[PDB]
Tab-separated table of C-alpha atoms and ligand atoms in Angstrom:
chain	number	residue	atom	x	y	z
A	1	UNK	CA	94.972	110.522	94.750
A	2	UNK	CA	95.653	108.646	98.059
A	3	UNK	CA	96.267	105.421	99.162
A	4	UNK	CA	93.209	103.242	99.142
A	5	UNK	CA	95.221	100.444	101.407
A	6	UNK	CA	95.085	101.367	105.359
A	7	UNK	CA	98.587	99.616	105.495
A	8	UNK	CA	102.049	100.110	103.565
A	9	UNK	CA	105.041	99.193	103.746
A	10	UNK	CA	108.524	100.370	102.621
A	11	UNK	CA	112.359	99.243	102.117
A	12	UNK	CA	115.566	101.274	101.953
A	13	UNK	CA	117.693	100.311	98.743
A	14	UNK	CA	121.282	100.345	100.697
A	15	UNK	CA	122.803	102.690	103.269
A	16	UNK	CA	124.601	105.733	102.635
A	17	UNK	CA	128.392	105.438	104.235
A	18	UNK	CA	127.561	108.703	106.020
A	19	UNK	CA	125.874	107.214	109.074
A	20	UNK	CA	125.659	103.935	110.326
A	21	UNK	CA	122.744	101.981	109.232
A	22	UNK	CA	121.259	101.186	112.464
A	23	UNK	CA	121.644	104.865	113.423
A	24	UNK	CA	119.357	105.706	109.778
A	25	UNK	CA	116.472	102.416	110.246
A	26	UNK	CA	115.720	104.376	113.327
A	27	UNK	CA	115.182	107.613	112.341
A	28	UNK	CA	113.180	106.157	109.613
A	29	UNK	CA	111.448	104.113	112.113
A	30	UNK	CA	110.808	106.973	114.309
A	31	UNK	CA	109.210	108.884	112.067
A	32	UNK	CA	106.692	106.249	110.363
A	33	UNK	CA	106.018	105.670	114.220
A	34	UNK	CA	105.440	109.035	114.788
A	35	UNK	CA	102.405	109.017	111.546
A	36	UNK	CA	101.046	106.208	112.734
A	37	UNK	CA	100.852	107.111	116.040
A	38	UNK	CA	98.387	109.413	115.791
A	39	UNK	CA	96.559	107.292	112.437
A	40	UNK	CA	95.179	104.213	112.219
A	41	UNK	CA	97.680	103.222	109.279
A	42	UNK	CA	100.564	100.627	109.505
A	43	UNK	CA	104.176	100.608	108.296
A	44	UNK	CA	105.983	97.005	107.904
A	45	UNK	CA	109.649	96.594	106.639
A	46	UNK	CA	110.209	94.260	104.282
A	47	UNK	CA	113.533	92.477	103.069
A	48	UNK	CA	112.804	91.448	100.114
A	49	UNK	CA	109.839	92.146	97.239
A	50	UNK	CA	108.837	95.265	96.373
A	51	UNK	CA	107.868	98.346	99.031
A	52	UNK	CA	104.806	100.617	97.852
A	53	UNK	CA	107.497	103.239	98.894
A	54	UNK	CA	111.346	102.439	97.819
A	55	UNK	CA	113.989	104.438	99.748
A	56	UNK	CA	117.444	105.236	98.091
A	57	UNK	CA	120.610	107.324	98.054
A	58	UNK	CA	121.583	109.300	94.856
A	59	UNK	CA	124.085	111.623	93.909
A	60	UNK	CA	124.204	114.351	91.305
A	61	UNK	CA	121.899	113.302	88.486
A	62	UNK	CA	120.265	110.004	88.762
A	63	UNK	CA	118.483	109.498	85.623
A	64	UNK	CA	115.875	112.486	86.481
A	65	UNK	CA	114.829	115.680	85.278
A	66	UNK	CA	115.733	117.260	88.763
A	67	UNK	CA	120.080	116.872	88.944
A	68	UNK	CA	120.989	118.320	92.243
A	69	UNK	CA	123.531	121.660	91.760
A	70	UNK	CA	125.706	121.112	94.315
A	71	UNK	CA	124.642	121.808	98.216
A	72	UNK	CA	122.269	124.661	96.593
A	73	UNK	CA	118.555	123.858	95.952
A	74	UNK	CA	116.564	121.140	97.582
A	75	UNK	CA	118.320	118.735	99.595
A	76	UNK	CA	116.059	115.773	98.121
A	77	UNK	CA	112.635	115.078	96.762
A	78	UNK	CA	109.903	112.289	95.986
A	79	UNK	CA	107.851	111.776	93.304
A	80	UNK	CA	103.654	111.597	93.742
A	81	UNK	CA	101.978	108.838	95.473
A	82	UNK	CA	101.662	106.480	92.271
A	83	UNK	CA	102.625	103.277	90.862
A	84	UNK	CA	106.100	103.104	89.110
A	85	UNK	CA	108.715	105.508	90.092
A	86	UNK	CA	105.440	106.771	92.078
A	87	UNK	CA	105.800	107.022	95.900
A	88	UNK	CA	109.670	106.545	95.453
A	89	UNK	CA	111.797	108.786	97.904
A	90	UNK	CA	115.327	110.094	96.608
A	91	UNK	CA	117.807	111.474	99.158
A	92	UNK	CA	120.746	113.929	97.968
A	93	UNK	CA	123.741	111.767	98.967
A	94	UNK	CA	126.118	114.799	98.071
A	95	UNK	CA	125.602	116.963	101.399
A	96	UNK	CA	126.170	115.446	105.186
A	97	UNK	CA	123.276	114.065	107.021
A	98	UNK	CA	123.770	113.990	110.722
A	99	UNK	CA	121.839	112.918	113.373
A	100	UNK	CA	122.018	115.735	115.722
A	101	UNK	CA	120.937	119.045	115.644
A	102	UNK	CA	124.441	119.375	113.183
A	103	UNK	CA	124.044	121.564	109.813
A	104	UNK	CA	120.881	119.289	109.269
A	105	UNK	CA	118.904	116.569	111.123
A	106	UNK	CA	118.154	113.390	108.632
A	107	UNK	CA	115.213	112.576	110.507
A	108	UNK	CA	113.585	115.994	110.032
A	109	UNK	CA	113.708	115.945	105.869
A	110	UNK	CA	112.849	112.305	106.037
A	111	UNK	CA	109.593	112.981	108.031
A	112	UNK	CA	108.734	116.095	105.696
A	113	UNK	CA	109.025	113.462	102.286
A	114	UNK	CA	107.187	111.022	104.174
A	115	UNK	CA	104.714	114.283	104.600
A	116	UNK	CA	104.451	114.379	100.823
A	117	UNK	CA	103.740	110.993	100.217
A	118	UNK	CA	100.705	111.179	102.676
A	119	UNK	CA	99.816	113.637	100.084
A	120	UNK	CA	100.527	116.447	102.550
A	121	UNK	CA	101.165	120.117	101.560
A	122	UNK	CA	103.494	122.501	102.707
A	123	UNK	CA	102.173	125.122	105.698
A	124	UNK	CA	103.026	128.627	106.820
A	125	UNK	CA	102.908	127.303	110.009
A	126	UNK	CA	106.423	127.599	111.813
A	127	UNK	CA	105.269	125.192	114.410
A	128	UNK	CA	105.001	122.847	111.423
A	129	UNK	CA	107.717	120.539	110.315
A	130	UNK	CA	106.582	121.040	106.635
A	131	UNK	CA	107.690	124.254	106.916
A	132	UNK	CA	109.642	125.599	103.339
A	133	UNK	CA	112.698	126.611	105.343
A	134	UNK	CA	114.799	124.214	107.292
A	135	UNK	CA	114.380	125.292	111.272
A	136	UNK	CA	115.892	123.272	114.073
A	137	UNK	CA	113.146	123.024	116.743
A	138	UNK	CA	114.198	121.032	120.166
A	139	UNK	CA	112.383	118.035	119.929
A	140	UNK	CA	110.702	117.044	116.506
A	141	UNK	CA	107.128	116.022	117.447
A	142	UNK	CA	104.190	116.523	114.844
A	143	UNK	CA	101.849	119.663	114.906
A	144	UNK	CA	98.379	119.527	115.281
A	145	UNK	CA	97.415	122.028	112.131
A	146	UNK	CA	99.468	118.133	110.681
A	147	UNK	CA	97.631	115.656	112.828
A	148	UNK	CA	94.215	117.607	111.995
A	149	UNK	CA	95.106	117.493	108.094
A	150	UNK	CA	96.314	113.909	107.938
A	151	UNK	CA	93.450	112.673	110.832
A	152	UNK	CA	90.536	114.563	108.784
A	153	UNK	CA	91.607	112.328	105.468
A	154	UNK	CA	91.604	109.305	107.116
A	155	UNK	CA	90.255	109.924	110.767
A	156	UNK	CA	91.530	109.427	114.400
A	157	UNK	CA	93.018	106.311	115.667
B	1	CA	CA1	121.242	120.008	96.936
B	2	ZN	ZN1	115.528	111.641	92.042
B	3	ZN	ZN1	108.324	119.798	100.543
């Protein structure tokens, strides 16, 4: 299942108090830039209506059948590209997101969930961001076993 639309667009439910919100839109921004960059797809914000992908902060359990135990386990998740909850992207508000290479970089788990909703799968590439285990790597740029994979589905820009 993919999308069948060439464009989407998305809209963040509120800000978590952790980091200023024009310090967050960015690094959301950047990394939406960063897919379509290198595919022909299109991201728009919208303020108001509904986003085929809603962004939100939750903490501990959230109505869901995945409760977060504490800074253990996965730091967030998303559920498949669908209608509904589908496509929805839930962040653990319990741990600190920073925006420096600090105990963990917000930008780099929001570009791996974006990564899932492309319908992306994880790699045991370490040059790849959708690497299982959390890695700091100087600059966060895509890698091309990622633009290959997400330019063969749709093509090249
Ligand atoms: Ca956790
Ligand atoms: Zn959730
Ligand atoms: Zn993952």
């Amino acid at each position: 299942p993919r999308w069948e639309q060439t464009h989407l667009t998305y809209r963040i439910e509120n800000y978590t108090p952790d980091l200023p919100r024009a310090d967050v839109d960015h690094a959301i921004e950047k990394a939406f830039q960063l897919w379509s960059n290198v595919t022909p797809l299109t991201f728009t914000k919208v303020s108001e209506g509904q986003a085929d992908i809603m962004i939100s902060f939750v903490r501990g359990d959230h109505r869901d059948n995945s409760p977060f135990d504490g800074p253990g386990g996965n730091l967030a998740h998303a559920f498949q590209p669908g209608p509904g909850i589908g496509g929805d992207a839930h962040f653990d508000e319990d741990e600190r997101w920073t925006n420096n290479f600090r105990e963990y970089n917000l930008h780099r788990v929001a570009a791996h969930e974006l990564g899932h909703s492309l319908g992306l799968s994880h790699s045991t590439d370490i040059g790849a961001l959708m690497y299982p285990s959390y890695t700091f790597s100087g600059d966060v740029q895509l890698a091309q076993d990622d633009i290959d994979g997400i330019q063969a589905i749709y093509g090249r820009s």
